[PDB]
Amino acid sequence: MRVPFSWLKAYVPELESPEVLEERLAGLGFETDRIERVFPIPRGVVFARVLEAHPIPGTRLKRLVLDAGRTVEVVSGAENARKGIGVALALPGTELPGLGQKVGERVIQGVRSFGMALSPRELGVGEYGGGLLEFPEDALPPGTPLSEAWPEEVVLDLEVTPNRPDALGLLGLARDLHALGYALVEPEAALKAEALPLPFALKVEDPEGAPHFTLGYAFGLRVAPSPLWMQRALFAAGMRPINNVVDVTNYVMLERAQPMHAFDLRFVGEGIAVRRAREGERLKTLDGVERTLHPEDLVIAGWRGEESFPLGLAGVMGGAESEVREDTEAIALEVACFDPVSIRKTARRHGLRTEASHRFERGVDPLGQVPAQRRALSLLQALAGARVAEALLEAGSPKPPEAIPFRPEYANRLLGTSYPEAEQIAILKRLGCRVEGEGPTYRVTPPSHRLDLRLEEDLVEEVARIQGYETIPLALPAFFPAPDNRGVEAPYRKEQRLREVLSGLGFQEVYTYSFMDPEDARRFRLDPPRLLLLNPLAPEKAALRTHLFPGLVRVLKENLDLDRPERALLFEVGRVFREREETHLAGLLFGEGVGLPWAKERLSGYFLLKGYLEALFARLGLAFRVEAQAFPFLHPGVSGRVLVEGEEVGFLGALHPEIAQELELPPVHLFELRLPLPDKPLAFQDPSRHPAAFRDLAVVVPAPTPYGEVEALVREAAGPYLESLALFDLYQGPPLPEGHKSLAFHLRFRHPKRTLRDEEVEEAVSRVAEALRAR
Amino acid sequence: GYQAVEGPEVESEFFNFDALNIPEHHPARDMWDTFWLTGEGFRLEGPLGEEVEGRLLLRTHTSPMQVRYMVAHTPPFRIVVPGRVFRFEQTDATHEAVFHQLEGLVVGEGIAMAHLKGAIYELAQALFGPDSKVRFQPVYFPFVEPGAQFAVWWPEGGKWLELGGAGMVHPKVFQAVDAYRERLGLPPAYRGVTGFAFGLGVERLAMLRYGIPDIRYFFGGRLKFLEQFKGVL
Amino acid sequence: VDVSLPGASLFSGGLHPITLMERELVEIFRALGYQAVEGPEVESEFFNFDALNIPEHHPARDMWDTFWLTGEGFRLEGPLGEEVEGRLLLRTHTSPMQVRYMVAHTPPFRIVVPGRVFRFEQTDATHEAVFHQLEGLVVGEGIAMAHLKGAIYELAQALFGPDSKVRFQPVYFPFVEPGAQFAVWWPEGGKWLELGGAGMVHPKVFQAVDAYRERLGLPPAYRGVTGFAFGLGVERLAMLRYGIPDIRYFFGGRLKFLEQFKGVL
Numbered sequence A: 001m002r003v004p005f006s007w008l009k010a011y012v013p014e015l016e017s018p019e020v021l022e023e024r025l026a027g028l029g030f031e032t033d034r035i036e037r038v039f040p041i042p043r044g045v046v047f048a049r050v051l052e053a054h055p056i057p058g059t060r061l062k063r064l065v066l067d068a069g070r071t072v073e074v075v076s077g078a079e080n081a082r083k084g085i086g087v088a089l090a091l092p093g094t095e096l097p098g099l100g101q102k103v104g105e106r107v108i109q110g111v112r113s114f115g116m117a118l119s120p121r122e123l124g125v126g127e128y129g130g131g132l133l134e135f136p137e138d139a140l141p142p143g144t145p146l147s148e149a150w151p152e153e154v155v156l157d158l159e160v161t162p163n164r165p166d167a168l169g170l171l172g173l174a175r176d177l178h179a180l181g182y183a184l185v186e187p188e189a190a191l192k193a194e195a196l197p198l199p200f201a202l203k204v205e206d207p208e209g210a211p212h213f214t215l216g217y218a219f220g221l222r223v224a225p226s227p228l229w230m231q232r233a234l235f236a237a238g239m240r241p242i243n244n245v246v247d248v249t250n251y252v253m254l255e256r257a258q259p260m261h262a263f264d265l266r267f268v269g270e271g272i273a274v275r276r277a278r279e280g281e282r283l284k285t286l287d288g289v290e291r292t293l294h295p296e297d298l299v300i301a302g303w304r305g306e307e308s309f310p311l312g313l314a315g316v317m318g319g320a321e322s323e324v325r326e327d328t329e330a331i332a333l334e335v336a337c338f339d340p341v342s343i344r345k346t347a348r349r350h351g352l353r354t355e356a357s358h359r360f361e362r363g364v365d366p367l368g369q370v371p372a373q374r375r376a377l378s379l380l381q382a383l384a385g386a387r388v389a390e391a392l393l394e395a396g397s398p399k400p401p402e403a404i405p406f407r408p409e410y411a412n413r414l415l416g417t418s419y420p421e422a423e424q425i426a427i428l429k430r431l432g433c434r435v436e437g438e439g440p441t442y443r444v445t446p447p448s449h450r451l452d453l454r455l456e457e458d459l460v461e462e463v464a465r466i467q468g469y470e471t472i473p474l475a476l477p478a479f480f481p482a483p484d485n486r487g488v489e490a491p492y493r494k495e496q497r498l499r500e501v502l503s504g505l506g507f508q509e510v511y512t513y514s515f516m517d518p519e520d521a522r523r524f525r526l527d528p529p530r531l532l533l534l535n536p537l538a539p540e541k542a543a544l545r546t547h548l549f550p551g552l553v554r555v556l557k558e559n560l561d562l563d564r565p566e567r568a569l570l571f572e573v574g575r576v577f578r579e580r581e582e583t584h585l586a587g588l589l590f591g592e593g594v595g596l597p598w599a600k601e602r603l604s605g606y607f608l609l610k611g612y613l614e615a616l617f618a619r620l621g622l623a624f625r626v627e628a629q630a631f632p633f634l635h636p637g638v639s640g641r642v643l644v645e646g647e648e649v650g651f652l653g654a655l656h657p658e659i660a661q662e663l664e665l666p667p668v669h670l671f672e673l674r675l676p677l678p679d680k681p682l683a684f685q686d687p688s689r690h691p692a693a694f695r696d697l698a699v700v701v702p703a704p705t706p707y708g709e710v711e712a713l714v715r716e717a718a719g720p721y722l723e724s725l726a727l728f729d730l731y732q733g734p735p736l737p738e739g740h741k742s743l744a745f746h747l748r749f750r751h752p753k754r755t756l757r758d759e760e761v762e763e764a765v766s767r768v769a770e771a772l773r774a775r
Numbered sequence B: 001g002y003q004a005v006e007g008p009e010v011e012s013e014f015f016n017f018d019a020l021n022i023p024e025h026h027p028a029r030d031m032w033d034t035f036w037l038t039g040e041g042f043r044l045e046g047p048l049g050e051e052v053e054g055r056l057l058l059r060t061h062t063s064p065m066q067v068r069y070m071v072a073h074t075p076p077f078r079i080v081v082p083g084r085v086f087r088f089e090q091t092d093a094t095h096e097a098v099f100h101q102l103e104g105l106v107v108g109e110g111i112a113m114a115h116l117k118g119a120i121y122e123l124a125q126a127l128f129g130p131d132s133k134v135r136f137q138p139v140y141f142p143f144v145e146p147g148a149q150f151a152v153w154w155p156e157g158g159k160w161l162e163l164g165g166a167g168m169v170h171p172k173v174f175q176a177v178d179a180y181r182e183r184l185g186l187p188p189a190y191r192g193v194t195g196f197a198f199g200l201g202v203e204r205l206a207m208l209r210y211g212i213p214d215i216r217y218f219f220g221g222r223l224k225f226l227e228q229f230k231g232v233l
Numbered sequence C: 001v002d003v004s005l006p007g008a009s010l011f012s013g014g015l016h017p018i019t020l021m022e023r024e025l026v027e028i029f030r031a032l033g034y035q036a037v038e039g040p041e042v043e044s045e046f047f048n049f050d051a052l053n054i055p056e057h058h059p060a061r062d063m064w065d066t067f068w069l070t071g072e073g074f075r076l077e078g079p080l081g082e083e084v085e086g087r088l089l090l091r092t093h094t095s096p097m098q099v100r101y102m103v104a105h106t107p108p109f110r111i112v113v114p115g116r117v118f119r120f121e122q123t124d125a126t127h128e129a130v131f132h133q134l135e136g137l138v139v140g141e142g143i144a145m146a147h148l149k150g151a152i153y154e155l156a157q158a159l160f161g162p163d164s165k166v167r168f169q170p171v172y173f174p175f176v177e178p179g180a181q182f183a184v185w186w187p188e189g190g191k192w193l194e195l196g197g198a199g200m201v202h203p204k205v206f207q208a209v210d211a212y213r214e215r216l217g218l219p220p221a222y223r224g225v226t227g228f229a230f231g232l233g234v235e236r237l238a239m240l241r242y243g244i245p246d247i248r249y250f251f252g253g254r255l256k257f258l259e260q261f262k263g264v265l
């Protein structure tokens, strides 16, 4: 929201400077995004009045005869150019913002143009450029440099939060600076109205849409360009001056956050009817756009006999037809409070966001209408010399705000401050609140323009910001947390110790988007994503990852393409989405592997990834193992399910080659599990001092048999004193059955209280060999 | 004395917006550009392991956890909540669509703003300082009145850094909590207690701390970048 | 391929139980705003005994069976990196650090001090010559005993409980009046455990601190502030927690024992 320093200074005279202002506002809850200097006008540009405008035969240009002090001629192509207005004359020699080429005397078309009159774009005061600036013919003595009446200005780009809609009016902010102690100057709306009756009527057919609605009557209007200070102020605020009357509705809309529209009576007919639009009703809106209405759209219409026609779009924009122009002498003034949601709906329904729509959507003072009318009207009488009727057409009586209970002690208690009661009330009262009651709990009724003030806390936030957030001391609380909060951190911590262990084991951590390309559900042989986006960022991020590894693999690729890493080992922990949200952990290995760099050999591949895995659990104190399992995305044979201590979670294996190749990628090794991992609470156990019983043993079993069942059996029959069981070797083997293999098993035994008697050793050994292949 | 706890990335419109004083058709619902979801058979769990209903979405901020926690527990307490959040804006170098935030909530009888101020101050000191200080400006949030945005003094680089938002928990939020609690059969626990909460951008901070320039760098799984933080500790 | 086969024998590391217990105790106090700092194992008779209200020829000096040292060219550093004098020894408890810290810093503060201490007793299953303790000190204006009581209570809750509670009995220590020995309620095993000692820092200790500070040119900082300190046996606790039976087990570098705590976290 643009804030012209000098304009606001009109309501807050004792303002220090734009900088102190930015300061004061930041503290009140308004952040300045930018500050700017704006109306630089050379001595070259002066005020001139068009005495005559003669068009040049055979051309679309006019020769303008100007009174600039001494008479002078310029040639203009601008359409609004005509006798009877004041203009901005850039004399020859003037340097203008736009043209790096200096203004000069050019012979245009049989006529020598002494300089040129300017459009807002050219003078630099505005974006327009499609026509000359138009001034009251008598604004200044012909010749006086414009700068004299048009000084540069400073404009703050402010940020008005949705809770401060009253702030969309400069007067709204001025009421705050006032709360801080500044003097406040409310414009006095002087008005000389007449007793006469109003030449039209008002019918509010949809009161749900237009809760409060008023009409004013002004006639005997002399429509002309707005005085300079107003054109200045409006241009400064980012709006473009049209004519005194229109300009007034905009000025006031910016002053109080109350949009309003002046309708030429010529088009009203018998009266104004506020009603929903009839299906397929047409309206050529102000912007010159022809539009078709929807029946939900609240509209401002007129009627003649049995004719009902749309004049403008309620709260959003006025019709092109009824809009005020030079030839207007009487109008009806719309000043209302519309229903935000309808406006919102209607507004975004067509491609529109206007000064008015914006404010109506955010909220308008439910009782600002009538005072608003007195202001605009008074202004009208002054700038357009309007005759104003003393009566208004009013519709819908809105109810005032209620008293809010307020305890000064509570305020201090909540902020942790100690402001004296008196200081507090003084503040609320400065903000326009009524404070009744003797204490300790008071009856505080907020002004109606304050829609954000409903609860006692809203009231406290107030004493706070006015006194200043910086005035709240620093403290630290101390208390024994309620019991049920005791263990809380466990899970989080668990995950972190894990995350940490990995990076320490040698895994580079990675962060992957939680999105998924529905297409990969195919590319990677896996079921489809159970959750999809209604507003995907891209059709390639339209689903929610069901698996983590696809992403890792995908990362693998792009890395290869950017930098060429020989090997890579990494992991990632993230939330995948299936029936329920789940925390998964996957890791990917690739490359030559580990070993001597220079020295030839490497040791890598699947059994390397497993190596690490086993170590990791070894470190976590969890007993893990793998068993071959068929996995759609995993090359078989090299596929396997994972068994954390006693359980099935995730998988591990080599990436199925088919996919390996569908992607410019060589071989990759993976694994993906579900967290949290289960945990085995340690049961400490005394180790015995009596030396163990050592053994040499091998097993010959079919080439297909899985190491698993093997170890399993041997183990389950070893007996209760088997301290260790390892595998030092195996090979298929020439010296034995074509379809069987050999197994080097080192064995150890121990008895806690005493040493193991050989009687029990070569005895139990058999206990195994027996049911060993007895099976 | 704060404890770290986590929430779900896929939330219900109820916990993300409704619970916190955020309206459907008003300007508030319009500060967060949300990602709506669809799909069936997806089971969303409530604070107590119950199934909850509401249009599904991707948590827009971590605040929802303020509610899941308060429903499941009893004050007084201190929690902090790290979490990956999701927003629909266009990704530039200081803004992303997938980022993380850290939420903080302290509820108890007697809690005041000065405590929130103290809290934040201890954070600055801990990060930069003791030659560093804290900046609290009023701002608006539906779930906290008084609301505030806060900046920290970076003595080194010599500039103010806007870190996050905070405020005193809104009455309507406490109300919502108890109301849902009784709906679940639990007794009201937040009548007569006070509290403050805050939330900050983690990437915005990691960037300033570890000297990273492009926020987009985080989700760009490039090793050459990742490895640069190997020995950060 | 046979996937059920063993992978590449990769080394799986572990951490010593004392380190584990240390870490846990520390994380706990860290949450109450305490900071962990360490002292030297070789101390001066001054910091170990003199600084703390402990006399030379009286019954107090006689509660700790000390290890005296000899050797030259050994440089002992003071709180400020200055050389200090006194008969060398092996810190008998961690308390000396109470002093080195207070000399080097300004209140208010909260610290906790883990440390290997040394005593000359005979090694049994519940007593050793080389063990660790954890010292705690909180100094500030307004500090009272209820704070020391609260502190300890939060520790019990954090270790066992909330069905656990704290026991404070008066006891004597030269460096704290009021002195106290404290036990914790172990709801599980159902017995009281005597954990350590604590009390309100003795005036004479604050005195000593400032006196040495001025000797070093620093202004007095502990006039008019209060404080409590405590100290506990770590092995005594690790044993109860991780279910170990012989305290001698800790310094017995046996792997079969050490590895038993691999996944403690």
Ligand SMILES: Nc1ncnc2c1ncn2[C@@H]1O[C@H](COP(=O)(O)OC[C@@H](N)Cc2ccccc2)[C@@H](O)[C@H]1O
Binding pocket: B061, B062, B063, B087, B089, B094, B095, B096, B097, B099, B101, B103, B141, B144, B162, B163, B164, B165, B166, B167, B197, B198, B199, B200, B201, B202, B203, B204
């Ligand atoms: N698109 C984006 N990319 C990265 N960081 C972003 C971001 N949008 C916001 N942030 C960071 O995330 C923080 C939180 O987002 P914002 O929408 O500002 O606050 C939202 C609340 N969760 C914070 C709060 C909690 C409790 C009480 C009051 C306020 C911001 O301070 C900002 O630093």
Ligand SMILES: Nc1ncnc2c1ncn2[C@@H]1O[C@H](COP(=O)(O)OC[C@@H](N)Cc2ccccc2)[C@@H](O)[C@H]1O
Binding pocket: C093, C094, C095, C119, C121, C126, C127, C128, C129, C131, C133, C135, C173, C176, C194, C195, C196, C197, C198, C199, C229, C230, C231, C232, C233, C234, C235, C236
């Ligand atoms: N020989 C030994 N072996 C193992 N643990 C021992 C031990 N002698 C004592 N301890 C343990 O170490 C702890 C401290 O030893 P103790 O001599 O009792 O106290 C000595 C002080 N450092 C404790 C204290 C600090 C501050 C204020 C008051 C007291 C005892 O509680 C005990 O559990």
Ligand SMILES: [Mg+2]
Binding pocket: A452, A453, A458, A459, A461, A462, B145
């Ligand atoms: Mg407010």
